[PDB]
Amino acid sequence: RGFRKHFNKLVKKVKHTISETAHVAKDTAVIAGSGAAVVAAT
Secondary structure (H helix, E strand, C coil): CCCHHHHHHHHHHHHHHHHHHHCHHHHCCCCHHHCHHHHHHC
């Protein structure tokens, strides 16, 4: 019954850290390779 409640709070930031870092493999074709690259293309 540890005070992991305040730890989970940090984890909330961690989950985003994990995402923001490796989520580029997905987000890459969300706007970059699906908008920004197009507008710059034609």
